[PDB]
Design a protein around this ligand. Structure first.
Ligand SMILES: Nc1ncnc2c1ncn2[C@@H]1O[C@H](COP(=O)(O)OP(=O)(O)NP(=O)(O)O)[C@@H](O)[C@H]1O
Ligand SMILES: Nc1ncnc2c1ncn2[C@@H]1O[C@H](COP(=O)(O)OP(=O)(O)OP(=O)(O)O)[C@@H](O)[C@H]1O
Ligand SMILES: Nc1ncnc2c1ncn2[C@@H]1O[C@H](COP(=O)(O)OP(=O)(O)O)[C@@H](O)[C@H]1O
Ligand SMILES: [Mg+2]
Ligand SMILES: [Mg+2]
Ligand SMILES: [Mg+2]
Lengths: 67, 890, 686, 257
């Protein structure tokens, strides 16, 4: 469960979560998000980079512990 | 009769007749001892117990039924010979402990009681039960308890025992798990209660058949059957039903004497009285290792080998009575030939010290083996390898190769155990090619890593519903060798299991490494290992292997003292002088090796720096070959720099003086950055100070700035790293951005280091504290080059090689056109570098190993791997590995 | 040393002058019962209360003669809890009232017995006297389970009792029985009895839910012989020639002897063998079969025609000797059989036990029938000393001392730890002598095997000394909470506070049940000895290492020292190991000069005998310390040893579990080797 | 409401994966994923009739729990009949002597296998999960398939137990080993690998050129014993009877020697 937070916090994205049909659905929803914001197809890797940037600027995950 | 037997055994006899002769000698020595001592001590009555105690045989051939022709009696117990065919079995020496065991067990059988020969391991308990059963002509089954136990077989085996009237002996009853122990104890209690009621005094005339409850049915019990439970206490159920016997100290001094007498040795008494305590000291004085075995089985193996050696010596002398041989010399030579190969280098002088103590004034001469020794010299010369005889440099390694070859002749199922850094792979490679060039028979070796692939992929799997068998890797190799579609017979095939061993993937191997040489597949197919196939186990520590696998293999221990550092320097210099890094380049390599020759000596700069760096503190465990190989690769990159500078300036190329200064300075730089290059700044400064103290080459004259922050320039002068770092002005929109890497003294140093170590394509790992900047320095440096692609893989705690296979499927492709299948990236001309951060993070299994790390080791050392789709060796090209991890102490 | 510790109390500060001043003290030590009349030795301003007087005399008994500690504990309990506190315990158990009232029918009645004994007789004749039938059922068979189920169901519905014998064979089914019994049981007169042997596979919840009754075989040769004769039925005895009755009497006597020598585990039998009823039955069957074979008819047969050799061999190698592992216990058993089972046993002058109580002897009964032998057995006097069994009369004394120490340990086991842990650790660090270095590994004189064994000795000694010092420093640091505590240190401190030696600290053989204090004191002595060895090697070298009065108790592996000494002797004069034999010379000088083959040993202790001029003599006093022992290895002359020497064993510790080597000691002409064999004379390293 | 629509689309488009078996039929592969999916769906519906919004969708949820109970009751016995049919096919097809020894059980298995191949062809036509449930009388067909296979397996077990009783050394070899022994009596080459677990030292038997009378026995090392009176397999065709004569004649010839 840990070290998967660490990858998405050091870089902003987890590359192991997205493969195959899940990756394709991610890319389709990235299409929809770019269209709402105003972007176009560009390149799939550029879409993934925009996804990572949006995760960095928006995601704020909070995890609590006892001393 | 004994004199005739001893005269006959000395000659050449066929092996079956030899075994018959040995058995007759053993029995006649027992008979001679009995008659000479236990009967001639003033005994004149045939009913005296001094004679009734002995095992007496009575033959009545007028009886019609065959089972009643021969009656066997000992004390008051009466048995009828079952006349079961036993073939030819090993006959034990009838020691007085064996006589006591026979007496007690036959007394227990007469009272319809069980037998419990308890005692330590290796004292002869199971063998004594088997020998007693064979003496009465009964079929004896031994149920080994080494987790090779089950209920479905055992119940019907008990039923068959009760029906036919055979014997059942348990190897070690206490090792069974509690529930299985209780259930088997219940079954044995039922059978023994059936046996006890069979001899009821009021019901001696058994009219109704004696029957027991087994498998929820009524099973008739034969009166000739018996159950023997061997221990190391008895269950409460069977305490009142079994007679115990203490078999603690076997009479080794008598077993050895009788066995040596049976081998033709005339001084068997003295030789036994010297060899038994010698093995006692070897058990005691020598260091404790798992693979050592000084038990009675090993002692018998040594005596049999000594007899074979003596017979071979007699044959050699005859083809050139013959009694004046040095019997002690034959025995010591056999002991050494059997035990020295599996000895740690520290224990070798100890073994010869004990040999001198027990055997005074006798010396061991090893076989010269000059016929293959010259061939080994030639193969070592053509591999740029270091070769030596005896005390000169390389003697230990060549002797170890000879021991490996000897044990290869002796038996199959090899195991070469040595700490990483010893000459293990090279030893058997040189042996294979030397044998190929000598005997003219072509040698093919298959390298298999058992942990890079699963057990199902290694051995094959059976479809849960279809019942279709697809063979595994080892199974496919064995089937291909046996089928001989191409002619793999008349060719020495070596199945080398490079990697480590654990009790899992060798479960199906135990059936072939032993004398059976049979592989039993769960589908039903059986494969027989052909005589020209040898299986080797090139392992490192041998700390997680069962004694069952270890005892079935001839073994050579490759200590780190075998492969001296001078040998590494000689190999490196020869490869630099001969193998180009791609003629002018090779000329540059010759020059550079000439400059660096004085430093790569026995007591040179590099050796002293190495012996210092061991006592320092490093983040990872220092290995001699890791730092040595890094050093060599950095020197290759130096030769590459010299060639590049020469190409840049077609006129006025690198001169001898400038080249000498550059190579001296770079070798100092390479000692600094390869030795203690993975340590703290303080350790680096300390090593720099020590090197300044010892070396004579000039160093930077600044007393404040240490040499680690300096560099050597192409002109041959020390220059600071501070002068090469540029001043950057990143844009405002990219302030503290994820991909912004500001060049600094560290960044530029590690940048040049990374270029150096990816020039020759070594995989490297930047190990450091969290937040240091490994993951960013790596990406910047790799993406700086234009022919490099980077794939970032994040190794989790559950990472498996399947992730690497998926990465290869996604980014690379398989091509069949060249000699073998080659795995290459789809894009042409771009070297695929696999980022592997948290490389130390994946969990070790129950047996102290990492699956993905072993997989990477196989892909890096051998250049490829075996794919499980169709079991062929795919070769990697245009693929690199790069790692990064936090310190192991985290 | 005991009176040195005892004087630490303020009331015992003048015990030294008190013990010097008193003259009747010496005759109080050799008194049979000193706890009866303990001299007033404590110094106290106020007259001590009867209770305080008892406590002070009890402490004195612990100091002087701790063997009577049990009797004095009895006296103290009587003076505090009242007289006749344990009197009802000595009386036979009367479970008539216990079964009638005080036990609810829900709670089962557990009858736990020591292995080798039965308990169904008491409940059976209780049922006979109370006239209430019981369904006796054995649990060993599978059908026993449902038979017991139906029987207990019928009893609960009706009001009868149920017997379940040998129920320890089914622990899980005992759990199921306890769960089923937890339900309400309608009838009040139902009683369930569970005959059991003491076995820890039995579930705890059944033990808590039932009333436990422990039964033990009464001690004594007379009681054991009565039990043996009662177990064997009368028809087996009085059949076939009348010589059979005497044979069974002899066999019962032998059984009684070799069962009571079990209670003296270290002195008399080394280990605790079973020697149960099964061996008795097998021996009886063997005697019956061989007497039938040798005597076809009923007529009496001559004692010389008894197959004595058959019986001796079958009861020394097959019966009673199968469970005997070590050589010396077998030698003892053969000695006992040869003394008892012989043609001389049928005369009127046979002596079953000699030297009893100094001069008395146990005369063989002159009987032909079973009844006379039995009546002889009930006429045995109650004053049974260990001399009946062949042990010396002080065997009971050491046994009582052992029971006293065990009682003290049991009291300790059934009794904020920061400060006491800190002070004990600090005293330990002050006690253990720092650490020694490996001043070894010299290329020259490496052929010396003593030198090499000393490399190894000092090596693991310093390794484990560093380990224990690191652990102690770590627990000291954690004591003030100066650093983090780990799991290994958790286990280590849990073991220290409980008083059990740590498992990670035992790298050498250790006596069973050793508390940490004596372990660290022994460790200190071993380390001091090794520092002496290291300093000697540094000062002189390999040659001087031979001239050391080394003590085998301080060595971790003395047998390795013996082997290394063999190698050293053999290397000199160019001899082999097979041709060297060990000869032992005991000398009064602690620093006597050693020749080329003599090696000094100190600390060897002889029990049961005293040595003078290399001649042994039987003595009542134990632990006769040897002044100095030279081990010499001489060329074997291949000669038979004379009948005036004994092969004594040399164990390492007082728990005779491990064997080191053997010594050939010449005995005085008045004794015989057999008496030495029966008395358990041995040499101890510690 | 959405959960029901994904369940509709997953069970409307679910396809039974089928794999060829020795070019005879196309058998169901993917038992584990199917069972897991069905279990998760039934657990999720059991979650949903417990939901407060279940009243609006009570009839749909009831119909779906009915169909999921049916689909589990179908495939739970389908996997069983699959396993038993494959076992019986492998043991009744890999040998030729098994027909003679158990003729009526062989005929029963031929009938049941003809039915199972017909059902396999019919399900191969439309492997759509639903198209497999709506077929006429599938449940009783699989119930009687499973019952007949169960009685045939029990009869087989009784036959092997009888064979063990006749020759008591067959108890040492396993069920599969004994089945191979009995079903392969005509060819002795595959018999010789079983002699090392039944007999003590015998590893092989030496026979005629045509394998008719047992000349003798041979040990593991090649040591041979010649029967004084060789026993004829042709005179005692049954495996147990001539093996018994082999053991008896071996004892007799050892006695004479
Ligand atoms: N040259 C540089 N330019 C810019 N930032 C840098 C540089 N060197 C270090 N840093 C900073 O140092 C940190 C390095 O982060 P990162 O690359 O994740 O190192 P890391 O140690 O490999 N991460 P981790 O895998 O958890 O150890 C970041 O906060 C960077 O901003
Ligand atoms: N005479 C020699 N024999 C063997 N290796 C030599 C010799 N001279 C130099 N070397 C070098 O020493 C190294 C020996 O590595 P080798 O493959 O034999 O070890 P290994 O034990 O199989 O490997 P690992 O370190 O993975 O356990 C190589 O780098 C080789 O070039
Ligand atoms: N009386 C004997 N004579 C000769 N060899 C013996 C004798 N007793 C034991 N051995 C040897 O000892 C070895 C191990 O005996 P084993 O029965 O395995 O002991 P354990 O039952 O304690 O494991 C055997 O290989 C056997 O050859
Ligand atoms: Mg064994
Ligand atoms: Mg290698
Ligand atoms: Mg990182």
């Amino acid at each position: 469960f840990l070290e998967r937070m660490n990858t998405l916090l050091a870089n902003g994205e987890v590359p192991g979560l997205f493969e195959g049909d899940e990756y394709a659905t991610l890319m389709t929803q990235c299409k929809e998000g770019a269209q709402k914001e105003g972007l176009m197809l560009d390149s799939h890797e550029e879409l993934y980079k925009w996804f990572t940037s949006q995760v960095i600027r928006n995601l704020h995950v909070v995890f609590t512990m006892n001393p | 009769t004994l004199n005739v037997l001893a005269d006959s055994v000395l000659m050449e006899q066929p092996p079956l007749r030899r075994r018959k002769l040995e058995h007759l000698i053993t029995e006649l020595v027992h008979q001679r001892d009995v008659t000479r001592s236990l009967i001639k001590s003033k005994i004149d009555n045939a009913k005296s117990f001094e004679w009734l105690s002995q095992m007496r045989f009575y033959f009545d051939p007028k009886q019609t039924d065959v089972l009643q022709q021969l009656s066997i009696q000992m004390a008051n117990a009466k048995f009828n010979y079952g006349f079961e065919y036993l073939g030819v079995q090993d006959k034990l020496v009838q020691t007085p402990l064996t006589d006591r065991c026979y007496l007690t067990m036959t007394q227990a059988l007469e009272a319809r009681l069980g037998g419990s020969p308890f005692g330590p391991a290796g004292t002869g308990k199971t063998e004594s039960v088997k020998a007693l059963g064979h003496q009465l002509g009964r079929f004896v089954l031994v149920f080994n308890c080494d987790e090779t136990f089950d209920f479905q077989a055992m119940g019907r085996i008990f039923v068959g025992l009760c029906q036919v009237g055979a014997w059942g002996c348990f190897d070690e009853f206490n090792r069974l798990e509690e529930r299985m122990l209780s259930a088997v104890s219940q079954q044995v209690q039922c059978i023994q209660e059936a046996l006890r009621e069979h001899s009821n005094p009021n019901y001696d005339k058994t009219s109704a058949p004696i029957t027991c409850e087994l498998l929820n049915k009524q099973v008739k019990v034969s009166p000739d059957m018996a159950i023997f439970i061997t221990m190391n206490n008895l269950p409460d159920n069977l305490k009142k039903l079994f007679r115990s016997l203490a078999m603690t100290k076997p009479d080794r001094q008598l077993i050895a004497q009788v066995m040596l007498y049976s081998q033709g040795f005339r001084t068997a008494e003295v030789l036994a009285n010297k060899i038994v305590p010698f093995f006692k000291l070897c058990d005691e004085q020598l260091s404790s290792q798992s693979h050592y075995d000084f038990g009675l089985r090993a002692l018998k193996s040594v005596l049999v080998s000594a007899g074979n050696v003596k017979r071979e010596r007699i044959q050699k002398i005859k083809r050139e009575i013959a009694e004046n041989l040095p019997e002690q010399e034959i025995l010591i030579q056999s002991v050494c030939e059997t035990m020295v190969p599996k000895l740690v280098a520290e224990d070798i002088p100890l073994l010869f010290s004990l040999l001198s103590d027990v055997f005074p004034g006798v010396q061991y001469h090893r076989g010269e083996m000059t016929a293959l020794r010259e061939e080994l010299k030639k193969v070592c010369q053509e591999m740029y390898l270091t070769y030596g005889d005896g005390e000169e440099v390389g003697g230990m390694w060549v002797e170890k190769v000879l021991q490996l070859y000897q044990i290869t002749q002796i038996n199959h199922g090899l195991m070469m155990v040595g700490p990483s850094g010893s000459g293990k792979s090279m030893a058997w490679r040189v042996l294979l090619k030397a044998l190929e060039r000598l005997e003219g028979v072509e040698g093919v070796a298959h390298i298999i890593d058992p942990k890079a692939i699963s057990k199902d992929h290694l051995y094959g799997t059976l479809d849960p519903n279809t019942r279709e068998w697809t063979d595994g890797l080892f199974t496919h190799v064995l089937r291909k060798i046996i089928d001989s579609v191409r002619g793999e017979l008349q060719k020495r095939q070596w199945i080398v299991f490079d990697g480590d061993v654990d009790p899992e993937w060798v479960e199906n191997l135990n059936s072939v490494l032993d004398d059976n040489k049979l592989l039993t597949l769960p589908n039903g197919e059986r494969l027989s290992l052909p005589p020209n196939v040898r299986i080797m186990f090139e392992v490192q520590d041998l700390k997680y292997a069962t004694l069952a696998t270890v005892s079935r293999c001839g073994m050579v221990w490759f200590s780190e003292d075998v492969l001296s550092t001078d040998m590494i320097f000689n190999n490196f210099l020869a490869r630099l002088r001969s193998i180009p890094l791609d003629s002018p380049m090779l000329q540059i390599q010759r020059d550079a090796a000439t400059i660096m020759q004085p430093y790569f000596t026995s007591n040179g700069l590099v050796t002293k720096a190495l012996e210092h760096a061991f006592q320092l503190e490093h983040i990872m465990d220092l290995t001699r070959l890791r730092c040595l190989g890094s050093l060599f690769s950095m020197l290759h990159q130096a030769c590459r720099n010299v060639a590049q500078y020469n190409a840049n300036h077609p006129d006025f190329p690198m001169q001898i003086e400038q080249l000498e200064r550059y190579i001296q300075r770079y070798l100092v730089y390479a000692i600094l950055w390869s030795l203690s290059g993975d340590s703290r700044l303080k350790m680096r400064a300390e090593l720099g100070e020590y090197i300044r103290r010892i070396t004579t080459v000039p160093l930077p004259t600044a007393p404040n700035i240490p040499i680690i922050d300096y560099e050597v320039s192409i002109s041959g002068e020390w220059s600071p790293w501070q002068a090469k770092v540029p001043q950057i002005e990143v844009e405002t929109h990219k302030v503290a951005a994820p991909d912004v890497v500001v060049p600094t003294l560290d960044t530029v140093r590690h940048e040049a280091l990374l270029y150096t170590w990816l020039a020759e394509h070594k995989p490297l790992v930047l190990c450091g504290p969290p937040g240091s900047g490994k993951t960013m320095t790596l990406f910047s440096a790799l993406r700086a080059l234009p022919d490099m692609e980077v794939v970032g893989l994040n190794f989790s705690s559950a990472t498996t090689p399947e992730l690497l296979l998926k990465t290869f499927d996604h980014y690379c492709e398989y091509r069949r056109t060249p000699n073998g299948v080659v795995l290459a990236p789809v894009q042409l001309g771009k070297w695929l570098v696999l980022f592997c951060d948290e490389i130390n993070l994946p969990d070790m299994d129950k047996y102290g190993t990492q699956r993905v790390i072993s997989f990477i080791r196989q892909m890096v050392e051998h250049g490829g791997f075996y794919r499980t789709s169709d079991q062929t060796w795919v070769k990697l090209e245009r693929i690199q590995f790069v790692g990064a991890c936090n310190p192991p102490t985290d | 040393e005991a009176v040195v510790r005892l004087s630490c109390l303020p009331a015992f500060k003048d015990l030294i002058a008190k013990v010097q001043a008193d003259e009747q003290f010496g005759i109080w030590l050799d008194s049979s019962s000193p706890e009866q009349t303990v001299p007033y030795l404590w110094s106290e301003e106020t007259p001590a209360t009867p209770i305080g007087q008892a406590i002070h005399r009890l402490l004195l008994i612990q100091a002087f003669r701790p063997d009577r500690l049990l009797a004095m504990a009895h006296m103290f309990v009587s003076t505090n809890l009242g007289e006749s506190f344990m009197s009802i315990m000595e009386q036979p158990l009367d479970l008539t009232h216990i079964v009638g009232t005080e036990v609810k029918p829900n709670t089962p009645v557990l009858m736990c017995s020591v292995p080798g004994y039965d308990a169904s007789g008491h409940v059976e004749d209780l049922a006979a006297e109370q006239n209430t039938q019981i369904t006796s059922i054995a649990i060993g068979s599978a059908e026993g389970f449902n038979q017991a189920d139906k029987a207990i169901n019928t009893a609960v519905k009706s009001g009868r009792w149920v017997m379940l014998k040998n129920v320890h064979l089914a622990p899980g089914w005992l759990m199921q029985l306890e769960k089923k019994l937890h339900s309400l049981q309608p009838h009040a007169c139902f009683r369930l009895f569970l005959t059991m042997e003491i076995n820890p596979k039995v579930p705890v919840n059944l033990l808590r839910a039932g009333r436990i009754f422990v039964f033990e075989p009464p001690p004594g040769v007379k009681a054991n012989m009565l039990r043996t004769f009662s177990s064997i039925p009368v028809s087996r005895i009085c059949k076939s020639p009348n010589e059979r009755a005497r044979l069974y009497f002899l066999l019962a006597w032998f059984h009684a002897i070799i069962q009571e020598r079990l209670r003296y585990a270290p002195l008399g039998w080394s280990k605790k063998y079973e020697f149960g009823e099964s061996d008795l039955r097998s021996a009886c069957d063997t005697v019956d079969t061989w007497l039938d074979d040798t005597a076809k008819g009923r007529q009496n047969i001559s004692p010389d025609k008894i197959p004595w050799s058959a019986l001796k061999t079958l009861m020394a190698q097959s019966i009673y000797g199968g469970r005997v592992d070590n050589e010396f216990d077998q030698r003892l058993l053969n000695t006992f059989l040869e003394r008892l089972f012989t043609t001389r046993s049928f005369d009127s002058e046979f002596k079953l036990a000699c030297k009893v109580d100094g001069h008395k002897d146990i005369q063989m009964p002159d009987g032909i029938r079973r009844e006379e032998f039995v009546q002889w057995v009930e006429l045995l006097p109650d004053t049974q000393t260990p001399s009946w069994l062949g042990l010396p009369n002080n065997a009971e004394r050491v046994l009582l001392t052992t029971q006293g120490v065990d009682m003290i340990s049991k009291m300790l086991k059934m009794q904020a730890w920061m400060r006491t842990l800190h002070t004990t650790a600090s005293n330990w660090l002050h006690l253990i002598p720092q650490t020694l270095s490996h001043l070894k590994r010299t290329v020259e004189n490496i052929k010396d095997p003593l030198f090499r064994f000393f490399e190894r000795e000092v090596k693991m000694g310093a390794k484990l000394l560093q380990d224990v010092r690191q652990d102690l420093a770590d627990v000291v640091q954690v004591c003030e909470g100066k650093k983090k505590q780990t799991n290994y240190l958790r286990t280590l401190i849990n073991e220290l506070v409980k008083g059990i030696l740590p498992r990670s600290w035992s790298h050498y053989t250790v006596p069973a049940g050793m508390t940490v204090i004596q372990w660290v004191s022994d460790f200190s002595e071993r380390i001091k000895q090794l520092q002496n060895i290291s300093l000697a090697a540094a000062s002189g070298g390999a040659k001087e290492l031979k001239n050391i009065h080394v003590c085998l108790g301080g060595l971790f592996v003395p047998e390795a020292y013996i082997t290394a000494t063999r190698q050293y002797v053999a290397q000199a004069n160019s001899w082999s190991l097979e041709e060297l034999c060990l000869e032992v010379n005991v000398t009064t000088s602690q620093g006597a000069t050693l020749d080329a083959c003599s090696f000094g040993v100190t600390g060897l202790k002889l029990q049961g005998a005293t040595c003078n001029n290399n001649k042994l003599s039987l003595s009542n006093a134990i632990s006769t310390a040897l002044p100095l022992t030279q081990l010499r290895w001489v060329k074997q002359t291949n000669t038979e040893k004379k009948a005036s020497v004994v092969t004594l064993p040399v164990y390492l510790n007082f728990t005779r579990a491990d064997l080191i080597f053997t010594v050939d000691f010449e005995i005085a002409t008045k004794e015989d080797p057999r008496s030495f064999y029966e008395r358990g004379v041995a040499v101890l390293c510690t | 409401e959405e959960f029901l629509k994904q369940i509709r689309e997953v069970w409307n488009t679910y396809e039974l994966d089928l794999v060829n078996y020795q070019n005879k039929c196309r058998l169901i592969r993917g038992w584990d994923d199917l069972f897991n999916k069905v279990k998760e769906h039934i657990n999720s519906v059991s979650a949903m009739k417990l939901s407060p919004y279940y009243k609006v969708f009570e009839e749909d949820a009831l119909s779906w729990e009915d169909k999921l109970n049916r689909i589990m009751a179908l495939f739970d016995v389908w996997i069983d009949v699959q396993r038993r049919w494959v076992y019986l096919e492998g043991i009744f097809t890999g040998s030729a002597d098994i027909k003679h020894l158990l003729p009526v059980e062989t005929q029963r298995f031929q009938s049941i296998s003809t039915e199972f191949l017909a059902l396999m062809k019919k399900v191969s036509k439309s492997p759509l999960v639903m198209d497999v449930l709506n077929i006429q009388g599938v449940q009783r067909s699989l119930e009687r398939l499973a019952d007949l296979l169960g009685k045939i397996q029990k009869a087989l077990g009784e036959y092997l137990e009888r064979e063990r009783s006749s020759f008591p050394r067959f108890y040492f070899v396993g069920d599969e080993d004994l089945l191979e022994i009995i079903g392969n009596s005509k060819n002795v080459a595959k018999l010789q690998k079983h002699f090392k677990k039944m007999f003590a030292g015998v590893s092989s038997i030496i026979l005629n050129e045509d394998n008719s009378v047992v000349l003798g026995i041979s040990s593991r090392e090649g040591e041979e014993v010649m029967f004084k009176t060789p026993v004829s397999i042709t005179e005692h065709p049954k495996i147990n009877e001539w093996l018994t004569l082999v053991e008896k004649e071996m004892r007799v010839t050892l006695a004479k020697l």
